[PDB]
Amino acid sequence: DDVPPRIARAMENEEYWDFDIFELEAATHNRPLIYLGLKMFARFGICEFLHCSESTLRSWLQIIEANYHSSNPYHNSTHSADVLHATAYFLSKERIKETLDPIDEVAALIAATIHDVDHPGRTNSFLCNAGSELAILYNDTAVLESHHAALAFQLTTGDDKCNIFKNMERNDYRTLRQGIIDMVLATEMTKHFEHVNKFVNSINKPLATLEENGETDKNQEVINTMLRTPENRTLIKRMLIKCADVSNPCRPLQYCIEWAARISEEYFSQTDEEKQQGLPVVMPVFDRNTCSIPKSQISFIDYFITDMFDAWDAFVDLPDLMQHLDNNFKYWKGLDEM
Ligand SMILES: Nc1nc(Cl)nc2c1ncn2Cc1cc(OCC(F)F)cc(OC(F)F)c1
Ligand SMILES: [Mg+2]
Ligand SMILES: [Zn+2]
């Protein structure tokens, strides 16, 4: 309501893909998730759906943003604000608007907010090797991913002031809870190709099969029938949260490079700790003393991004994102200079 001018100007073109997320981070003083959350949740009408007040939402975005570590270069509140922004953008697109229901939009925006809450700047395999409290707690299986979702609901419902789900109906909340959990757990690295293969096989290929006829009225309702099913909506939710999470290579060049440094700094810090404590080196290529960030980003984009966003683009139609993916890939290539 009474947003200050810097933070208000920083959130001018939040609908657009081109959005200065670090200016918002600088404006908010490492509090971008609360300000960007309030606008987006209001723009979608999330507390109107959930039957929470505006005051319950402020308290909710505060306690979650508090649990995001400022010391983490990449995995902090500004990363979640970025992922929240990419999620909303995908929800706003026509394909996703005319496929998913209102409950899915709420699950997506809530999932994006919480998906890395209380991240220790360290990977799952580091915690499993180190014998961490959470690695013992989740039995070396989806350690971070389960901790995020679990804690996110411990903070939400456990206190009355933070509980945005308090006024819901038990049947609706049970669906929404299950949907959020699935979207948060779908971000795990080890399940990458399972969720990509499932998306292409059940959405892209059958949608491509249905375009053999073209744009018939009986055929369009069949295309509506098949995609909108409970199972196929879950797959689009898994694909949207996976794309939004790792959308930084599809950003404007400056933000791509800033996100590239942060995640790289974070892996160097782990690697420096791994050799210090006598741990086995899980990500040996990511050492500050041997890692080429431009070459490493090309490999990252080759392995994870190019097939995933191609599959996603064909579904949603993302000319701006894929043109950035071409420009950013070409920039990383051009930094060899040897
Ligand atoms: N630009 C970036 N470069 C690097 Cl190397 N990692 C980045 C990054 N942006 C986000 N990350 C996190 C990340 C995401 C990832 O895919 C997540 C999915 F599979 F769930 C796999 C990763 O392993 C390996 F590439 F390091 C790391
Ligand atoms: Mg994560
Ligand atoms: Zn993440």
Side-chain angles (χ1 to χ4, degrees), residues 1-165 167-173 175-216 219-222 224-282 284-338:
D1 301 350
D2 299 314
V3 181
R6 181 97 110 79
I7 297 165
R9 286 193 207 90
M11 301 187 291
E12 272 174 32
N13 299 358
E14 42 51 59
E15 325 99 309
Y16 286 75
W17 184 249
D18 205 319
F19 186 69
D20 203 341
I21 200 73
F22 304 105
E23 173 53 35
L24 189 61
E25 177 184 58
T28 58
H29 304 270
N30 304 321
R31 307 169 58 77
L33 198 67
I34 192 165
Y35 283 97
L36 189 60
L38 285 160
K39 186 160 182 190
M40 293 283 186
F41 278 47
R43 202 190 81 188
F44 273 85
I46 297 181
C47 261
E48 297 157 46
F49 182 90
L50 297 165
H51 310 280
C52 38
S53 63
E54 191 180 314
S55 193
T56 307
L57 180 51
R58 284 199 172 182
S59 305
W60 185 72
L61 293 158
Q62 171 51 56
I63 196 164
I64 294 163
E65 183 150 55
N67 286 237
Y68 281 98
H69 307 165
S70 284
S71 51
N72 283 345
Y74 187 83
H75 283 106
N76 59 56
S77 64
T78 314
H79 163 67
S80 293
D82 188 32
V83 172
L84 180 68
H85 181 251
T87 300
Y89 179 82
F90 298 146
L91 292 182
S92 304
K93 282 280 184 164
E94 182 59 21
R95 180 74 83 173
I96 303 304
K97 196 180 288 186
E98 76 201 338
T99 304
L100 303 181
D101 295 342
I103 195 167
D104 303 311
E105 293 188 321
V106 172
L109 292 159
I110 292 166
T113 314
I114 71 188
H115 78 299
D116 292 319
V117 71
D118 204 38
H119 208 300
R122 293 283 174 282
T123 58
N124 284 328
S125 298
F126 178 89
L127 299 166
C128 303
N129 288 300
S132 195
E133 286 172 296
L134 286 291
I136 297 288
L137 186 61
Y138 292 106
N139 305 283
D140 312 326
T141 307
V143 171
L144 291 158
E145 287 76 35
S146 307
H147 177 54
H148 301 316
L151 188 70
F153 278 99
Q154 285 178 330
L155 298 166
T156 305
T157 60
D159 203 343
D160 296 314
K161 296 176 285 185
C162 317
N163 190 7
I164 60 164
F165 308 118
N167 296 301
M168 284 199 75
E169 297 163 26
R170 286 144 177 167
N171 297 335
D172 288 275
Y173 167 71
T175 316
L176 177 58
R177 172 172 166 75
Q178 197 172 19
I180 291 157
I181 288 160
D182 200 69
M183 288 186 76
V184 172
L185 291 166
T187 61
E188 192 174 3
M189 202 272 287
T190 199
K191 299 171 186 165
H192 178 92
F193 295 101
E194 184 188 309
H195 299 308
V196 173
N197 293 335
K198 278 176 176 176
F199 186 83
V200 177
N201 287 317
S202 303
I203 294 153
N204 291 335
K205 291 181 184 175
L207 180 52
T209 310
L210 294 157
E211 290 169 21
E212 75 195 335
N213 300 322
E215 310 191 70
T216 318
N219 190 237
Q220 193 70 16
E221 196 165 29
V222 170
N224 286 208
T225 304
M226 189 269 299
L227 297 169
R228 295 172 173 178
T229 56
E231 285 76 37
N232 283 353
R233 289 188 307 152
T234 309
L235 305 191
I236 296 158
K237 279 149 69 179
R238 291 169 183 187
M239 199 71 175
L240 194 149
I241 199 74
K242 280 169 59 53
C243 291
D245 179 38
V246 298
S247 54
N248 64 76
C250 302
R251 293 292 191 188
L253 183 52
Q254 292 172 30
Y255 313 141
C256 163
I257 297 155
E258 179 55 33
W259 289 127
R262 287 181 167 195
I263 196 79
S264 290
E265 170 54 33
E266 196 164 301
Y267 292 141
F268 304 150
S269 302
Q270 180 173 312
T271 304
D272 286 28
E273 198 173 10
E274 281 175 334
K275 269 182 278 188
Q276 188 184 23
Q277 299 203 326
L279 294 158
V281 189
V282 305
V285 298
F286 304 124
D287 190 344
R288 59 180 69 267
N289 303 315
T290 63
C291 189
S292 173
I293 295 160
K295 293 185 183 180
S296 296
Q297 289 298 336
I298 289 158
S299 307
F300 178 65
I301 290 162
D302 278 314
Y303 205 78
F304 298 93
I305 304 296
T306 319
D307 297 313
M308 181 160 61
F309 271 89
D310 168 46
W312 187 237
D313 166 56
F315 185 58
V316 186
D317 200 22
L318 300 160
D320 305 331
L321 279 75
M322 300 300 289
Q323 183 56 90
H324 282 302
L325 185 50
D326 182 49
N327 189 59
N328 293 356
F329 190 82
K330 285 171 176 164
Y331 175 77
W332 294 127
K333 287 279 179 186
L335 290 175
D336 191 8
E337 304 171 37
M338 289 153 194

PDB file of all heavy atoms in Angstrom, residues 75 79 115-116 119 144-145 148 187 245, ligand 2:
ATOM      1  N   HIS A  75      21.805 -18.781  -3.551  1.00  0.00           N
ATOM      2  CA  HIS A  75      20.590 -19.305  -2.908  1.00  0.00           C
ATOM      3  C   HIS A  75      20.165 -18.461  -1.702  1.00  0.00           C
ATOM      4  O   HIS A  75      20.348 -18.853  -0.545  1.00  0.00           O
ATOM      5  CB  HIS A  75      20.761 -20.786  -2.523  1.00  0.00           C
ATOM      6  CG  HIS A  75      20.640 -21.725  -3.682  1.00  0.00           C
ATOM      7  ND1 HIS A  75      21.723 -22.366  -4.242  1.00  0.00           N
ATOM      8  CD2 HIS A  75      19.559 -22.122  -4.395  1.00  0.00           C
ATOM      9  CE1 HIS A  75      21.316 -23.122  -5.245  1.00  0.00           C
ATOM     10  NE2 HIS A  75      20.006 -22.991  -5.360  1.00  0.00           N
ATOM     11  N   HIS A  79      17.149 -14.830  -5.220  1.00  0.00           N
ATOM     12  CA  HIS A  79      16.970 -15.957  -6.136  1.00  0.00           C
ATOM     13  C   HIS A  79      15.497 -16.391  -6.194  1.00  0.00           C
ATOM     14  O   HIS A  79      14.946 -16.566  -7.280  1.00  0.00           O
ATOM     15  CB  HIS A  79      17.880 -17.128  -5.753  1.00  0.00           C
ATOM     16  CG  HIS A  79      17.481 -18.430  -6.369  1.00  0.00           C
ATOM     17  ND1 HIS A  79      17.555 -18.667  -7.725  1.00  0.00           N
ATOM     18  CD2 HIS A  79      16.994 -19.563  -5.814  1.00  0.00           C
ATOM     19  CE1 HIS A  79      17.132 -19.892  -7.979  1.00  0.00           C
ATOM     20  NE2 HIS A  79      16.785 -20.456  -6.835  1.00  0.00           N
ATOM     21  N   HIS A 115      10.543 -22.659  -2.412  1.00  0.00           N
ATOM     22  CA  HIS A 115      11.320 -23.813  -2.934  1.00  0.00           C
ATOM     23  C   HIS A 115      12.789 -23.991  -2.483  1.00  0.00           C
ATOM     24  O   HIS A 115      13.311 -25.100  -2.594  1.00  0.00           O
ATOM     25  CB  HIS A 115      11.264 -23.872  -4.473  1.00  0.00           C
ATOM     26  CG  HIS A 115      12.177 -22.901  -5.154  1.00  0.00           C
ATOM     27  ND1 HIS A 115      12.074 -21.536  -4.995  1.00  0.00           N
ATOM     28  CD2 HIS A 115      13.217 -23.104  -5.994  1.00  0.00           C
ATOM     29  CE1 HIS A 115      13.011 -20.941  -5.710  1.00  0.00           C
ATOM     30  NE2 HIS A 115      13.720 -21.871  -6.324  1.00  0.00           N
ATOM     31  N   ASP A 116      13.452 -22.920  -2.036  1.00  0.00           N
ATOM     32  CA  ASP A 116      14.816 -23.005  -1.476  1.00  0.00           C
ATOM     33  C   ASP A 116      14.941 -22.328  -0.103  1.00  0.00           C
ATOM     34  O   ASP A 116      15.996 -21.776   0.220  1.00  0.00           O
ATOM     35  CB  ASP A 116      15.836 -22.375  -2.443  1.00  0.00           C
ATOM     36  CG  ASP A 116      16.011 -23.164  -3.722  1.00  0.00           C
ATOM     37  OD1 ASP A 116      16.054 -24.413  -3.672  1.00  0.00           O
ATOM     38  OD2 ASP A 116      16.142 -22.530  -4.793  1.00  0.00           O
ATOM     39  N   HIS A 119      18.205 -22.685   2.633  1.00  0.00           N
ATOM     40  CA  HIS A 119      19.242 -23.343   1.833  1.00  0.00           C
ATOM     41  C   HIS A 119      20.592 -22.996   2.482  1.00  0.00           C
ATOM     42  O   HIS A 119      20.851 -21.819   2.746  1.00  0.00           O
ATOM     43  CB  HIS A 119      19.207 -22.823   0.385  1.00  0.00           C
ATOM     44  CG  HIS A 119      19.699 -23.801  -0.638  1.00  0.00           C
ATOM     45  ND1 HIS A 119      20.974 -24.322  -0.627  1.00  0.00           N
ATOM     46  CD2 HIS A 119      19.090 -24.328  -1.724  1.00  0.00           C
ATOM     47  CE1 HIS A 119      21.123 -25.142  -1.652  1.00  0.00           C
ATOM     48  NE2 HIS A 119      19.994 -25.163  -2.335  1.00  0.00           N
ATOM     49  N   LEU A 144      17.583 -31.464   0.799  1.00  0.00           N
ATOM     50  CA  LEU A 144      17.246 -30.043   0.746  1.00  0.00           C
ATOM     51  C   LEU A 144      15.792 -29.831   0.344  1.00  0.00           C
ATOM     52  O   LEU A 144      15.074 -29.080   1.003  1.00  0.00           O
ATOM     53  CB  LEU A 144      18.173 -29.309  -0.226  1.00  0.00           C
ATOM     54  CG  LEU A 144      19.627 -29.214   0.248  1.00  0.00           C
ATOM     55  CD1 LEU A 144      20.587 -28.990  -0.907  1.00  0.00           C
ATOM     56  CD2 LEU A 144      19.783 -28.129   1.303  1.00  0.00           C
ATOM     57  N   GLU A 145      15.360 -30.535  -0.701  1.00  0.00           N
ATOM     58  CA  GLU A 145      14.032 -30.342  -1.303  1.00  0.00           C
ATOM     59  C   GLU A 145      12.901 -30.628  -0.320  1.00  0.00           C
ATOM     60  O   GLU A 145      11.911 -29.896  -0.282  1.00  0.00           O
ATOM     61  CB  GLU A 145      13.857 -31.204  -2.563  1.00  0.00           C
ATOM     62  CG  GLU A 145      14.650 -30.725  -3.777  1.00  0.00           C
ATOM     63  CD  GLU A 145      16.135 -31.049  -3.713  1.00  0.00           C
ATOM     64  OE1 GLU A 145      16.510 -32.113  -3.171  1.00  0.00           O
ATOM     65  OE2 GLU A 145      16.939 -30.227  -4.197  1.00  0.00           O
ATOM     66  N   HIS A 148      13.004 -27.849   2.593  1.00  0.00           N
ATOM     67  CA  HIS A 148      12.410 -26.571   2.178  1.00  0.00           C
ATOM     68  C   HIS A 148      10.905 -26.596   2.406  1.00  0.00           C
ATOM     69  O   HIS A 148      10.370 -25.766   3.133  1.00  0.00           O
ATOM     70  CB  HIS A 148      12.695 -26.257   0.699  1.00  0.00           C
ATOM     71  CG  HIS A 148      14.150 -26.188   0.357  1.00  0.00           C
ATOM     72  ND1 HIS A 148      15.073 -25.542   1.148  1.00  0.00           N
ATOM     73  CD2 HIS A 148      14.842 -26.684  -0.696  1.00  0.00           C
ATOM     74  CE1 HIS A 148      16.270 -25.645   0.602  1.00  0.00           C
ATOM     75  NE2 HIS A 148      16.157 -26.330  -0.520  1.00  0.00           N
ATOM     76  N   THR A 187      11.977 -29.824  -8.093  1.00  0.00           N
ATOM     77  CA  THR A 187      13.185 -29.045  -8.361  1.00  0.00           C
ATOM     78  C   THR A 187      14.504 -29.794  -8.111  1.00  0.00           C
ATOM     79  O   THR A 187      15.566 -29.262  -8.431  1.00  0.00           O
ATOM     80  CB  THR A 187      13.204 -27.747  -7.523  1.00  0.00           C
ATOM     81  OG1 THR A 187      13.197 -28.071  -6.125  1.00  0.00           O
ATOM     82  CG2 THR A 187      11.999 -26.865  -7.858  1.00  0.00           C
ATOM     83  N   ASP A 245      12.995 -22.037 -12.032  1.00  0.00           N
ATOM     84  CA  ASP A 245      14.122 -22.179 -11.106  1.00  0.00           C
ATOM     85  C   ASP A 245      15.455 -21.858 -11.778  1.00  0.00           C
ATOM     86  O   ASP A 245      16.275 -21.128 -11.214  1.00  0.00           O
ATOM     87  CB  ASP A 245      14.168 -23.593 -10.508  1.00  0.00           C
ATOM     88  CG  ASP A 245      15.345 -23.801  -9.557  1.00  0.00           C
ATOM     89  OD1 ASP A 245      15.684 -22.862  -8.803  1.00  0.00           O
ATOM     90  OD2 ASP A 245      15.923 -24.912  -9.558  1.00  0.00           O
TER      91      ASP A 245
HETATM   92 MG    MG B   2      16.698 -26.061  -4.827  1.00  0.00          MG
END
